[PDB]
């Protein structure tokens, strides 16, 4: 007879993981010894929040469950800040939580929490083993949910348990569904969206990430209506690549026309989007289409709700959407996205390839030239996220992105590589770091060193929390707590034993980012960034960058976009006279 | 400009609300103000419990929102067994739970409670209002949430912040999404389901709640491949009747040959089922189809997973079914169907019409019989579960049937049925209600005649925990606590100001319940029936009684069925020469 | 080897538990039989909700644990209410929630619900056990727990868990402490309290339920610094008896010179109270004396907080506060609170005696002089607790009352009463009921009658949410939802086989509860009294009767007062020359 925790490794080695994040010790000790004796690699991190951060990004990248590990009470605590964020993002992750002896539950003991209440809000399933037969039966229950969709599953094992009797497997002999089940609408909500093209004389759709198995049939429907496409980020990568109907972003970091198509077309489109900046959105005739229902109408009104996948629906409706032959709106709009994109690039970065420190959106243009048309990208939450948004580009859709879009912690991007980069070691992975988020987790370079893992952090290296200065900056308050003295990254990674540069000159920032892209190697290229670039039109608020101003708005940050203006401009060329 | 209660009150009439359970008090007064002031009805309770439980009962018939609301504190706390009840059960439930003034909380304050945290269990949407803005806003959420069938919602209110200004609309002008999308299953799922169907030489299906809508497909696919069909509980109302395949349920409260053709064929496939009772399921070879991924698997071994609809999922397979020829295994288990039915019949309801103190069965067989086509019946918990599932009948399924069948709590056979009873006085509703469910919300009685609601309350008094009589000679262990001194609830009604009726002679209680049932108004029906009439076969186990023996079993308690029997003999009489 | 079970009960037994509160099912079987061979009594109640509020209830009277019972997942949910009550209340309560099987929990079982989280706000204990060595620890932490002053203990038990072998006896074998320490103040906050004390020319005391072992030192305190003593609710049964200093009661249920004594005073010493409304108290120099530091200043700006036992503290600051000779302020206020209690009799309750449907004053004024001198009286939540606090009296501090004064729930008076009756069935014990309490929860009449307990259960019965009809006329709003249709409570009892009388005539009022309440035996009086006593200043406001308005306030609800204008009177008689 096999452990409770030989079973746990067994099954999941039998599902295919191939390696477990974690920090060995204590109530984890019978588990980590499983996983010796098998073929799963243990990946030991410094901070057990890098190991929740590492697996959901390599679930992201593979589509596949991954997994994370933490000892009792403080060990599992850890797992917290990268437990939101794989659940915000939907990846399909298992934490095994370990946990006090059994025999001192409730005895107030040392190292004692609760962990089966504690990550109620960050997960889809969280139980308690108390025996090993049932511990077989939870494991397979928190695998099936989170396979299914439903977000982070934590199993809490207290020590002890994990060296009884496995159970006799009945539940670790299943096999798991993970297959994508094809929603189609209710037609009488289909027949209803059908009307409401039909009646608009002009359409646009805006698409988030609910549109990633999508693409074909977006643009068919954009094609036969005649309509621009704009997206919120977490739709970016999929649609915005080769579009005929591009018309950019919305939000604060927004660009192009999209917030002016989204609020003067007769119809407006949600699919596959609950982007959140309510105030970007309008009200009198929006449809929203959602694999989730409990999702409608949460940002805006919604006068024509579907709950059904975008493709299903899409294939659904097309035979009853009337062809629009009127293209005036898409014309007028396509010509005024270009033309914003080209004023913004003329208002800020107008020889910005001489400014002095080096600006930040020189550094990103040059990255999304360099960079592998499949590297992933992985981007800390601050400024990197507006240089990400502008300036880094999807050609054919063959980079993948990880980033804490939606929990909104800092420091997630060193941590996403380290998972991005395990899944396949000869695949470029590039961090785009701040320094505030490399500093609050700085010993996952040990980490980075001690697997040799070859991805190129990038560190925006400005000395700012320089969205906070924005926020500030834009509220009127005096300026606080946010800049600080320099930090030589470059320095601190070499004497961590990592290949490392530090740019400071414009000039040289092409040969040695190019350089260091191409080391064999991990590598840390430290770039001295000029903390006042972030450029903000004195009419934005305090309340509109916490998101809390209702009123209309179509104001965006300052500062240019990137290579995205060469689709803009070749589907000028392109509209048909 | 309207306060916040007006406008949450405007928001439910636009979307159809008829009738609000409730109890007044404090923080719920501006509420019902604007209650009082616009269409729908006030319903008022003695216990707030019975205005959760009326609730779900209403929105189990209907199919539509239904609303409950409590005062703060102790009021909202006494809603929780009926949001549990109606969550478990998949009601679309919107619970109002009026909260202490906002500027008290944190003060231990009179009445304080914390609802948004009690109810997160018994809720799939469970938040607090802070402002009338995003008071309009969560109770959109909180419609939307239980409208696309995440179970019940609770919106927590401050009770000064009903009385604040409205918001301005943009959340409650939205239309909700009520449809039902059609959930065809992955490609590669269906095939490995068709694969596994075409190489098994028989096939038995076992049916739950999930084929509601699919009995068309069900039985073609049947037809096709010469299953034999068996039922959990919360099947039974949508599959036993007309059905040509039919061979009972499963559990302790089964029935017929289901368990037998369950665990012989060569491939069982669960649709649209749960069912808990693990030791009565097979593991050698098992499909199962589940709207509901994270629940595929739960009960048993399951080698073919596919997460789609039932029908949807049929009609997609079925021309890639081979037709079977062979319908030997199908007339063996439509055999064994008929000769088990008999032989409990023989064995247990001898000259039942005879027995005195009356048999309760006796009593359920003459319900059935006498009661409408079309009537609603409500199952209060414990051995009331048994009777209704031996015999009543859903012939041409137009009866509806309510009960606690996964919360399991006592009591709900009287509020299910007045919640029922509202949607329309002219439908008859039968409560089949136990003395001890009865005495548990016994102030109901006082709610049944304010609204002079015409349902008509069948108490099986037997003076007993009848259930808990069971489990304990089950376990061989000394009666003790379950047998009480009998009560009358045939004058305590009548002192309530109900007719009522009190049969205690086996040759007067065809006459006595039909006289009753046609009594156009509320009654109640106290039938003294014999405690002992329980007959529990002397190996099944506590263990296996509370549900934790794992051990392969087919044994089901003691005692007859009823006109379930017609249909098997028939379906003998019909078996192909 | 015992079972854990056995040992759970024979721990109770051992600290000398006579009873336990519950309804007997699944999961708690084993503890019933061990209960059944034990010394302890199993009092079966219809609704659990009963079982925790007469454990309460019982606790509060003797001063020792109470224990309350309930079954799996719904039987043990049915607790809360009273879990709450008493938790607020400061009961010694343990409740042994029983659980579904521990191999089901995680597994979406049959009615599963996660007790150990629900219970967390309504306990100061509650843990799960997950083994019978582990149970036999976390039952003794329970226990200290409650018995140390903690509240509410809750261990929540799997039922297969309680047929597991006993622990080895360590933790049973303890001694509980249950003793009370002495505990004096700082010496720095009381000579910062002696200073304030001193420089007063006037001084006001205002004692709650903390001056429960303290009379004599607050005696003693007022009488040397000629300081009027007030009182909260909490305080009342402790300190207004033959008190030369007596001012009366503050908040709106409030009466005599309290509020002003307590405004005009130079110095406020707030002793033992956490009364929460704080629009009637002062704020410019106050003291509080509390034994937890954590609610000093809870309610209004403290200057001087003293963390310390009553009696203790003003032992300790006794011989450094200079006697006051000045007796003009407590002159001043004996004559005020005289003259207002005069008023309000004068005012309300000219010829009571006469008035049609019955005063519910009247009732209150025969109920003190006719009940006996030790009798428990339990106080139902609504107008009954406007009529205890105005009308029954505690001469020689010989009576004990029970209401739920904190956490303000409806329908404790008879379930308090169960409990409080059943620790001397020699002691008289009336139950002020209100018809919206006493049909919240009905069926435990038929608790009454099966137990023989003979309480006195006096029935407001004015057809009648009375407070509520109050906060509504008090609002300004159409009565709406809180008067419904006569029912007849007399008969209803009589049917359920108690005694009882209906009251309706004034002139027999006397006669006829002089009978009832010598009864030997359990007894329902239902007085049908006037929906439309309640008089309210137009002055009141909604946000006054629900406790958010700020602004300082003296007003106190219309109505009379009775016998507690003796002691006011022969206190002014009494007055020095
Ligand atoms: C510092 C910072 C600033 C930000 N600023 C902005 C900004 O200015 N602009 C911006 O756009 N974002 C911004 N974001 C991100 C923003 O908060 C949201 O996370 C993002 O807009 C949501 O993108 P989304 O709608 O694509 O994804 P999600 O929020 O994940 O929504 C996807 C939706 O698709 C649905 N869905 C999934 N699959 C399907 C399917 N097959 N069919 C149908 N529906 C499906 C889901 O149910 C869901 O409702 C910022 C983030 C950061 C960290
Ligand atoms: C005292 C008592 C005794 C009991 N004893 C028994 C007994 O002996 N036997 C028994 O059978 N029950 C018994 N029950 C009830 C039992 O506990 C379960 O509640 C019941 O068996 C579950 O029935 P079900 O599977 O139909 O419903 P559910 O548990 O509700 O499961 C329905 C399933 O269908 C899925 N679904 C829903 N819609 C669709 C769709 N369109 N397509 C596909 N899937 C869908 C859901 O996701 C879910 O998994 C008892 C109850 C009580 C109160
Ligand atoms: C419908 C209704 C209306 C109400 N209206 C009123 C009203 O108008 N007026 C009113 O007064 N109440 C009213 N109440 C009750 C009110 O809400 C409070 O519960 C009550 O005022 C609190 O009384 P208390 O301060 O004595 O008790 P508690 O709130 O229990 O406070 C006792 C305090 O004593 C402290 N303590 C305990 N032992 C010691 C010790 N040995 N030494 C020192 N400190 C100690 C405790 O820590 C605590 O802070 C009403 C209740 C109901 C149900
Ligand atoms: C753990 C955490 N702390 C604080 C924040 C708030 N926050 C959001 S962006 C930001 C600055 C990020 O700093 P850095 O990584 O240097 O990037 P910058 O904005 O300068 O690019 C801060 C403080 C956060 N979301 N997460
Ligand atoms: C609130 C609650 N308390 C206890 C139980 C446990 N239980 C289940 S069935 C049963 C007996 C039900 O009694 P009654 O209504 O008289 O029906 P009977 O079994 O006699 O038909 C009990 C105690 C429950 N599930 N819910
Ligand atoms: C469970 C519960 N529901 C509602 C309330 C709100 N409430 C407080 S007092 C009151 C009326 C009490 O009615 P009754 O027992 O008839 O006494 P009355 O005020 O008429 O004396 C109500 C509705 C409460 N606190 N507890
Ligand atoms: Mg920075
Ligand atoms: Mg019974
Ligand atoms: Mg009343």
Redesign the pocket.
């Given at each position: 007879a096999h452990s409770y925790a030989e079973q746990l490794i067994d099954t999941l080695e039998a599902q295919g993981v191939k390696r477990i994040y974690g920090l060995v010790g204590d109530s984890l000790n019978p588990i980590v010894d499983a996983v010796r004796q098998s073929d799963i690699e243990w990946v030991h991190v410094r901070n057990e929040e890098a190991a929740a951060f590492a697996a959901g990004a390599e679930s992201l990248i593979t589509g596949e469950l991954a997994v994370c590990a933490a000892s009792c009470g403080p060990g599992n605590t850890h797992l917290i800040?990268g437990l939101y964020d794989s659940h915000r993002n939907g990846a399909k992750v298992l934490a095994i939580a370990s946990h006090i002896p059994s025999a001192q539950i409730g005895s107030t003991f040392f190292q004692e929490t609760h962990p089966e209440i504690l990550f109620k809000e960050c997960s889809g399933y969280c139980e308690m083993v108390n025996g090993g037969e049932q511990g077989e039966r939870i494991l397979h229950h928190a695998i099936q949910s989170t396979m299914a969709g439903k977000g982070v599953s934590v199993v809490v094992i207290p020590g002890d348990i994990a060296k009884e009797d496995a159970g006799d497997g009945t539940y670790s002999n299943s096999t798991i569904s993970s297959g994508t089940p094809v929603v189609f609408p209710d037609p009488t909500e289909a027949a209803a969206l059908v009307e409401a093209i039909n009646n608009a004389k002009s359409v646009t759709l805006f698409c988030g990430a609910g549109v990633k198995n999508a693409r074909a049939q977006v643009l068919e429907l954009a094609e036969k209506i005649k309509s621009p496409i704009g997206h919120a980020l977490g739709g970016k990568q999929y649609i915005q690549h080769e579009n005929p109907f591009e018309v950019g972003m919305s939000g604060l970091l927004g660009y192009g026309a999209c917030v002016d198509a989204s609020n003067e077309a007769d119809l407006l489109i949600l699919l596959g989007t609950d982007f959140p900046y309510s105030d970007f959105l309008p009200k009198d005739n929006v449809a929203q289409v959602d694999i989730n229902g409990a999702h409608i109408g949460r940002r805006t009104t919604v006068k024509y709700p579907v709950t059904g996948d975008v493709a299903a629906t899409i294939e659904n409706i097309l035979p009853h959407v009337k062809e629009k032959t009127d293209r005036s709106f898409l014309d007028r709009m396509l010509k005024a996205h270009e033309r914003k994109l080209s004023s913004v690039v003329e208002t800020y970065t107008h020889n910005v390839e001489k400014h002095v420190p080096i600006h930040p959106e020189y550094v990103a243009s040059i990255l999304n030239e360099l960079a592998d048309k499949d590297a992933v990208f992985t981007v800390?939450?601050?400024?990197?996220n507006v240089w990400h948004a502008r300036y880094i580009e999807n050609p054919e859709g063959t980079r993948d992105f990880v980033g804490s879009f939606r929990h909104?912690?800092?420091?997630n991007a060193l941590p996403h590589a380290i998972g991005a980069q395990s899944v396949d070691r000869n695949r470029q992975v590039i961090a785009m770091?701040?320094?505030?988020?490399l500093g609050?987790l700085l010993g996952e370079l040990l980490t980075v060193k001690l697997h040799q893992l070859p991805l190129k952090a990038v560190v925006?290296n400005?000395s700012?929390?320089?969205?906070?200065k924005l926020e500030m900056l834009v509220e009127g308050q005096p300026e606080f707590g946010t800049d600080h003295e320099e930090v030589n990254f470059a320095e601190i990674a070499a004497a961590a034993g990592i290949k490392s540069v530090r740019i400071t000159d414009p000039k040289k920032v092409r040969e040695q980012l190019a350089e260091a892209l191409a080391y064999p190697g991990p590598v840390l290229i430290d770039i001295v960034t000029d903390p006042n670039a972030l450029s903000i039109p004195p009419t934005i608020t305090w309340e509109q960058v916490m998101g809390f101003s209702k009123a209309a708005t179509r104001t965006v940050f300052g500062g240019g976009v990137g290579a995205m203006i060469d689709l803009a401009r070749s589907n000028i060329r392109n509209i048909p006279t």
């Amino acid at each position: 007879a096999h452990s409770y925790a030989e079973q746990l490794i067994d099954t999941l080695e039998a599902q295919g993981v191939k390696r477990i994040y974690g920090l060995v010790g204590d109530s984890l000790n019978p588990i980590v010894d499983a996983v010796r004796q098998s073929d799963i690699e243990w990946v030991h991190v410094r901070n057990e929040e890098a190991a929740a951060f590492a697996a959901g990004a390599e679930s992201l990248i593979t589509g596949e469950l991954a997994v994370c590990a933490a000892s009792c009470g403080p060990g599992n605590t850890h797992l917290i800040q990268g437990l939101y964020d794989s659940h915000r993002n939907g990846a399909k992750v298992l934490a095994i939580a370990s946990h006090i002896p059994s025999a001192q539950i409730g005895s107030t003991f040392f190292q004692e929490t609760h962990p089966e209440i504690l990550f109620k809000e960050c997960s889809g399933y969280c139980e308690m083993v108390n025996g090993g037969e049932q511990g077989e039966r939870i494991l397979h229950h928190a695998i099936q949910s989170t396979m299914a969709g439903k977000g982070v599953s934590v199993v809490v094992i207290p020590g002890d348990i994990a060296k009884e009797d496995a159970g006799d497997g009945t539940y670790s002999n299943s096999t798991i569904s993970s297959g994508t089940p094809v929603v189609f609408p209710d037609p009488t909500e289909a027949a209803a969206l059908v009307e409401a093209i039909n009646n608009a004389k002009s359409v646009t759709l805006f698409c988030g990430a609910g549109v990633k198995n999508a693409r074909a049939q977006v643009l068919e429907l954009a094609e036969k209506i005649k309509s621009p496409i704009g997206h919120a980020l977490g739709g970016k990568q999929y649609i915005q690549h080769e579009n005929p109907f591009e018309v950019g972003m919305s939000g604060l970091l927004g660009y192009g026309a999209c917030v002016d198509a989204s609020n003067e077309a007769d119809l407006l489109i949600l699919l596959g989007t609950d982007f959140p900046y309510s105030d970007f959105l309008p009200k009198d005739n929006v449809a929203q289409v959602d694999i989730n229902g409990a999702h409608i109408g949460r940002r805006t009104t919604v006068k024509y709700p579907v709950t059904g996948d975008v493709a299903a629906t899409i294939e659904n409706i097309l035979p009853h959407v009337k062809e629009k032959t009127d293209r005036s709106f898409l014309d007028r709009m396509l010509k005024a996205h270009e033309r914003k994109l080209s004023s913004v690039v003329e208002t800020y970065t107008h020889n910005v390839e001489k400014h002095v420190p080096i600006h930040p959106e020189y550094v990103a243009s040059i990255l999304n030239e360099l960079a592998d048309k499949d590297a992933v990208f992985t981007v800390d939450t601050g400024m990197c996220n507006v240089w990400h948004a502008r300036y880094i580009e999807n050609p054919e859709g063959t980079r993948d992105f990880v980033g804490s879009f939606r929990h909104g912690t800092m420091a997630n991007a060193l941590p996403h590589a380290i998972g991005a980069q395990s899944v396949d070691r000869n695949r470029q992975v590039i961090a785009m770091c701040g320094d505030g988020g490399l500093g609050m987790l700085l010993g996952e370079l040990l980490t980075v060193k001690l697997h040799q893992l070859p991805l190129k952090a990038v560190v925006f290296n400005n000395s700012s929390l320089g969205m906070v200065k924005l926020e500030m900056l834009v509220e009127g308050q005096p300026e606080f707590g946010t800049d600080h003295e320099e930090v030589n990254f470059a320095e601190i990674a070499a004497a961590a034993g990592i290949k490392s540069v530090r740019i400071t000159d414009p000039k040289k920032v092409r040969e040695q980012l190019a350089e260091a892209l191409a080391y064999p190697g991990p590598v840390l290229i430290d770039i001295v960034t000029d903390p006042n670039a972030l450029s903000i039109p004195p009419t934005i608020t305090w309340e509109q960058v916490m998101g809390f101003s209702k009123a209309a708005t179509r104001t965006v940050f300052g500062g240019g976009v990137g290579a995205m203006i060469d689709l803009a401009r070749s589907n000028i060329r392109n509209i048909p006279t």
